[PDB]
Design a binder for these strands. Structure first.
Ligand SMILES: [Mg+2]
Ligand SMILES: [Mg+2]
Lengths: 73, 145, 52, 64, 189, 146, 143, 67, 57, 55
RNA sequence: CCAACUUCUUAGAGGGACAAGUGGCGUUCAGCCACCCGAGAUUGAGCAAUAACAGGUCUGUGAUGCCCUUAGAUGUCCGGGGCUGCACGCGCGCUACACUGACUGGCUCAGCGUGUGCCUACCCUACGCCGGCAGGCGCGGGUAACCCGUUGAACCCCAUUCGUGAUGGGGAUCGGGGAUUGCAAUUAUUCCCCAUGAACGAGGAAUUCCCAGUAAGUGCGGGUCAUAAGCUUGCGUUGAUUAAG
């Protein structure tokens, strides 16, 4: 119910790049409570997963950046 | 860029007498030092030629040594004169930023100076009163009993 | 109120003064008899210097 | 015991009631016949001729 | 045909209850591009019912003073939230919004200025505008009190409470508390 | 160069609360801009669909013979887009009562009246002055008794 | 086609011209540039470390739309809302000697001239290349 | 709030009693007649009298009013 | 020399008017005063009293 | 007496040197537009100046 | 005349709305409820009776009765101090408790109004050049729809950083320095800088104000003003949730 962690270990980063580009709603507020990171690396790492091409960008607003799962078939 | 971490990451650092937090970033991690405020911290770092967006436990000891060195004697690193704590100090006539137990040293020293020669400011520090001419009839109740 | 007692009332005096502007290319001598047509207390007329 | 949550259209509104001007008597009709018509009360503003749905249909009217 | 916020047209949407078609205004006569207009709705009564529900949701969202006239700031709360809604579901968000209005509007409550049996005693019915008023009030409130101390945005907390209230699971605030109105109305029936 | 048809044009205003905005519109070929800059390059951009809105439910290509341009003066950020939304709406309505038939003007006024009448009526509500005993016009200072 | 400055997005036209002046290193940047706080209605230093180029890009563009702007006028347009702590917030003026130094630095860059009256306009050499890069940034809106 | 004070009704009755041969059930002509034939100190009570004049046109064309 | 603003022109001759009203009240009260009336020209100004007993003034 | 310091405290700036031009109080006076009358009986002469209220 | 005109702006006149028109109710009375047309189908305020109150004010007034005091004067002036003193209680208010936010930067919108004085010294400020800031000088304009001023107001809008932590929320307290007003700043005038970083997690009983450009948010200007607004009186801006009993 208190402090999270910045700067990923090995155990959450492979958990990131195996299922976080799979599900449909993906947002820095989501993966800073479904994971055990706090945010501002939610914003940092999910920016570069848009830089790779594992997900799609939709909204891009300053209060709210919203991604989605990528084209499957 | 830090996708996982490098090999060593201080949980806490250790700077003057303060163990600054290791998960903050340096612009707001060294503000735990009494004497390094929210404004002085950015200026020391910009004179330290660093990248501001790096976090706390991922500075090497050469970075930590050079950050402490610039905030220790800032008068020679081209930091201007009315940016410092002790501008024209009342015992020596010099200019210094004070950052330690020496901050609280020179804090009480002027308190006991005024208490010695019995100035009106020093008498209200010797009492539990307000100093900067505030009213006392209705405010500040929870200092006294 | 002349004193402080009462129920916090306010009177809003105001004075709305009107002003109009007229040009002439007249010879500047007959403006004296233009001034000399009517006494008319409530107005205030002013004649510009004739030097343009 | 188990009632269908039955909806009902209103005829003439019978003016305010409820000691604060909060409740309105409305005289509903039960959407299936106009012969069956109970007088009831709602809160909130009405607009004569609309449709409102009774969670349980017959309890009481306002009389002492 | 008019595509509220540029997309999500309003022909496939169907209001299920007969009791609320004359009070929910999703149809083509009252469908716009974005919910912001020179209103004039509490001049004469009963014209807050042909005000469209996207406008009536974005008016009831800026509430507590520090956000009290910020209407260009709550219109994007709803603009983003429809896209979060569309991705978790795949449905037209106006359809799932009016399912939330149907299912969060109560049917019974009680009224008494005397001898508080619980609080109010004599259980009454409800007109089909006050259940629309209390639909939008419960939804905007629960989206607010569940995002006050949270990393979660108001846009996601709005979106995932009314798709949680349109299904109906007592996990959204507008369902778990509306039942307590209908429990306490049966308790002094 | 004035060689053909000098000044076949009108200049038509629209208002909200202080914000006036007068649309000068000539004969030409499909150009719409406000204070110099285009309609899609406009400041708020959250209200984007309600200032290019007469263009939508009338038609860009159909109504592309006019070269509307607007100057705006006074108001706020929201009132200055309702003022141009009113202005360019009733500009080409007023451009049609002067140069083509009113059968066509009623043909577009049919669109611009059943769709939220405020595009060519000036919304009359205004500032409504403060009074001398409260923080505003209606509200009052807090009364105490004990 | 012919695209002027007025039909381009101008939040990022400023980003275009700031990147232009940063790479064309002919701007007389002051020595005190990293400890400035920018106009005492705010309590932190500017976040962008090369902030002097985006202030220069901005004050050239506002000078394009308004002739006769002086150092008093530029501080009335970069001012903001000073929070007074426990007292209510108010408007306050910008910083004068960041406005004076940036107009003098653009005059070394030959993109601003003085006037018959007081104030400053920009020279035709000045406007011809912020129209040239305005065409580039409207083309880079596609590109 | 429509209810018309005694000076509106009394002065409109002395028109219709005395100038009935000039009046009709048009508002905008009776407004011009009452302007010309009465002395009315302001415009608002002028057409507030003239409206009650047109009301009594449809009233005394039916039957014996106090007429 | 230099002249003053039109806003304080009008309050100055209004307060000129109010001052000699009060003095000519205090003088001519026993002699049927009943006010004054002023006319300013760019010459001799002319103030007419409105006394009821014009013999006693 | 001894004229060097009879009236020597400097009546300049400050409300000990403003006064009413009618009525000779130093409190509440209105120095707007050069009126310099007392608050309490500006209201007397307010019509003699020509300041009507709203009607 | 090396052009016309008044839409926008400012006034002045006149017009315009009357419950007029159409249904429905009502004694087919007074009138009410709906619509259509229309900018508007109740704009907002001022004045405001009869008779009173032992209401307040002699500290506003050369309004004033009576009493008191009048030179070791309750007159008046000068200097210092006080009206700001604090175990506490109450009333107006301001800023907050954050992420619907705080930063840092871009970006664009106002209106009401005020300005150099008879005594009375001192006004509003453009521009230029010094200063990291408040500020300092030189140089103009303005007795004002002529200049400040197209009053580039804040909120809001767009990106950046921050991540639910009494935190980059909050900024009380307090040390040291720097300027300005002034005859004089101590018991800090105000402003600036650096540092210090307190309670405070939405508030019990109770209680206030308000129903449309309203509440509320948000700044601006008059008053006081040598220096000065958390007050007051006005102005615009953004703009509603509830109700027609
Ligand atoms: Mg007195
Ligand atoms: Mg938070």
């Amino acid at each position: 119910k208190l402090n999270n962690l910045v700067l990923f270990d090995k155990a959450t980063y492979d958990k990131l790049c195996k299922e976080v580009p799979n599900y449909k709603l993906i947002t820095p507020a989501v993966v800073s409570e479904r994971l055990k990171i706090r945010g501002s690396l939610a914003r940092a790492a999910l920016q570069e997963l848009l830089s790779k091409g594992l997900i799609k960008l939709v909204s891009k607003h300053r209060a709210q950046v919203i991604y989605t799962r990528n084209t499957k078939g | 860029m830090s996708l996982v971490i490098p090999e060593k990451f201080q949980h806490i650092l250790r700077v003057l007498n303060t163990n600054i937090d290791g998960r903050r970033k340096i612009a707001f991690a060294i503000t735990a030092i009494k004497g390094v405020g929210r404004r002085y911290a950015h200026v020391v770092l910009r004179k330290a030629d660093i990248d501001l967006t790096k976090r706390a436990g991922e500075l090497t000891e050469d970075e930590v040594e050079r950050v402490i060195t610039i905030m220790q004697n800032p008068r020679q690193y081209k930091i201007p004169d009315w940016f410092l704590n002790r501008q024209k100090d009342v015992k020596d006539g010099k200019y210094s930023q004070v950052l330690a137990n020496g901050l609280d040293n020179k804090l009480r020293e002027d308190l006991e100076r005024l208490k010695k020669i019995r100035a009106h400011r020093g008498l209200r520090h010797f009492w539990g009163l307000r100093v900067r001419g505030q009213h006392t009839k209705t405010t500040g109740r929870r200092g006294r009993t | 109120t002349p004193c402080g007692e009462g129920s916090k009332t306010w009177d809003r005096f105001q004075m709305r003064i009107h002003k109009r502007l007229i040009d002439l290319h007249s010879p500047s001598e007959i403006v004296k008899q233009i001034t000399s047509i009517s006494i008319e207390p409530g107005v205030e007329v002013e004649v510009t210097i004739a030097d343009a | 015991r188990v009632q269908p949550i039955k909806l009902a259209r209103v005829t003439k509104v019978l003016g305010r009631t409820g000691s604060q001007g909060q409740c309105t008597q409305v005289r509903v009709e039960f959407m299936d016949d106009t012969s069956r018509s109970i007088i009831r009360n709602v809160k909130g503003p009405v607009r004569e001729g609309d449709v409102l749905t009774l969670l349980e249909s017959e309890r009481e009217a306002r009389r002492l | 045909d008019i595509k509220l916020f540029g997309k999500w047209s309003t022909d496939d949407v169907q209001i299920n209850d007969i009791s609320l078609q004359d009070y929910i205004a999703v149809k083509e006569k009252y469908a716009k591009y974005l919910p912001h207009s020179a209103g004039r709705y509490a001049a004469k009564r009963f014209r807050k019912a042909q005000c469209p529900i996207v406008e009536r949701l974005t008016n009831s969202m800026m509430m507590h003073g520090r956000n009290n006239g910020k209407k260009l700031m709550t219109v994007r709360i709803v603009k983003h939230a429809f896209e979060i809604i569309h991705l978790l579901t795949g449905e037209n968000p106006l359809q799932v919004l009016v399912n939330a209005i149907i299912n969060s509007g109560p049917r019974e409550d009680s009224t008494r200025i005397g001898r508080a049996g619980t609080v109010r005693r004599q259980a009454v019915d409800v007109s089909p505008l006050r259940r629309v008023n209390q639909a939008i009030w419960l939804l905007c409130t629960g989206a607010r009190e569940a995002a006050f101390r949270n990393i979660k945005t108001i846009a996601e907390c709005l979106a995932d409470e009314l798709i949680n209230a349109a299904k109906g699971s007592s996990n959204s605030y507008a369902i778990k508390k509306k039942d307590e109105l209908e429990r306490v109305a049966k308790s002094n029936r | 160069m004035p060689s053909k048809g000098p000044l076949q044009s009108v200049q038509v205003f629209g208002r909200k609360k202080t914000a006036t905005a007068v649309a000068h519109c000539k004969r030409g070929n499909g150009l719409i801009k406000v204070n110099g800059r285009p309609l899609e390059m406009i400041e708020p951009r959250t209200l984007q669909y309600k200032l290019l809105e007469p263009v939508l439910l009338l038609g860009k290509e159909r109504f592309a013979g006019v070269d509307i341009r607007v100057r705006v003066k006074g108001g706020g950020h929201v009132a200055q887009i309702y003022a141009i939304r009113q202005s360019i709406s009733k500009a080409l309505v007023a451009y049609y009562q002067k140069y083509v038939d009113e059968a066509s003007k009623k043909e577009i006024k049919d669109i611009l009246i059943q769709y939220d009448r405020t595009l060519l009526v000036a919304d009359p509500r205004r500032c409504e002055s403060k009074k001398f005993g409260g923080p505003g016009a209606r509200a009052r200072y807090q009364k105490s008794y004990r | 086609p012919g695209v002027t400055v007025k039909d381009v997005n101008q939040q990022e036209f400023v980003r275009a011209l700031a990147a232009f002046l940063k790479k064309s290193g002919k701007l007389k940047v002051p020595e005190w540039v990293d400890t400035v706080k920018l106009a005492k209605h705010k309590e932190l230093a500017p976040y962008d470390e090369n902030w002097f180029y985006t202030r220069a890009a901005s004050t050239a563009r506002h000078l394009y739309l308004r002739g006769g702007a002086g150092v008093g006028s530029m501080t009335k347009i970069y001012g903001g809302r000073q929070r007074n702590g426990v007292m209510p917030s108010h408007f306050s003026r910008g910083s004068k000697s960041v406005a004076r130094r940036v107009l003098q630095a653009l005059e070394g860059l030959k993109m601003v001239e003085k006037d018959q009256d007081g104030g400053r306009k920009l020279t035709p050499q000045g406007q011809r290349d912020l129209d040239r890069i305005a065409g580039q940034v409207a083309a880079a809106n596609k590109k | 709030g429509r209810v018309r004070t005694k000076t509106v009704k009394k002065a409109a009755r002395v028109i219709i009693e005395k100038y009935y041969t000039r009046l009709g059930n048009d508002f905008h002509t009776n407004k011009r007649v009452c302007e010309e034939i009465a002395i009315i100190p302001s415009k608002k009570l002028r057409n507030k009298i003239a409206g009650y004049v047109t009301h009594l046109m449809k009233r005394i064309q039916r039957g014996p009013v106090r007429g | 020399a230099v002249q003053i603003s039109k806003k304080r022109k009008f309050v100055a001759d209004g307060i000129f008017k109010a001052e000699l009203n009060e003095f000519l009240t205090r003088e001519l009260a026993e002699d049927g005063y009943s006010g004054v009336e002023v006319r300013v020209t760019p010459t001799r100004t002319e103030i007419i009293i409105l006394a009821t007993r014009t013999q006693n003034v | 007496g001894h004229q060097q310091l009879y009236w020597s405290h400097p009546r300049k700036f400050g409300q000990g040197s403003r006064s009413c031009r009618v009525c000779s109080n130093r409190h509440g006076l209105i120095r707007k537009y050069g009126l310099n009358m007392c608050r309490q009986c500006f209201r007397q002469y307010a019509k003699d100046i020509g300041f009507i209220k709203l009607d």
